[PDB]
Amino acid sequence: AFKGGGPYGQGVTRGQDLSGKDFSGQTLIRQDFKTSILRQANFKGAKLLGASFFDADLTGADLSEADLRGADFSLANVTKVNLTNANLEGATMMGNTSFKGSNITGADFTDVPLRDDQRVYLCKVADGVNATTGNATRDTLLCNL
């Protein structure tokens, strides 16, 4: 329970080194993690609607079962992140974002705009149904049409 729980002021989370910090299950709607370091951070089941991970480093983080609707992952390092059952409906991930090594089993990528190259990679590793939405990960990604 990071700093006993919060809510957290934006100054607490923005441009900070928060590696290995535990935010699991917390309400973090529109929390500003822009350009923070979040390696191995725990966001399992966190509520992160509209949160900013703009140019954050999420390497190895747990975002499994997180509510990430409308969150911004543009320019983020999302390598080796657990996104099992994460809801990314309407999130953004512009530019040089890397998802290399990430587990996206049952992730929901509805209305997430993707470049061809991002869709190609994600579709190589995409499977499952979202425990929450029953959308098929491959369909949200439009892998097969």
Q: How much of the chain is in helix, strand and coil states, percent to nearest 5?
A: 15, 15, 70
The torsion angles phi and psi of 74, rounded to 5 degrees, stand at -55, 135
The distance between the two most distant Cα atoms of the chain, rounded to a whole number of Å, is: 47
- Tell me the domains of the chain and their CATH numbers: 1-145 (2.160.20.80)
Solved how? X-ray
User: Cα–Cα distance between 104 and 99 in angstroms, integer?
Assistant: 9
Q: Which residue shows structure tokens 């500003």?
A: 32
Find residue 62's DSSP bridge partners.
Answer: 42, 82
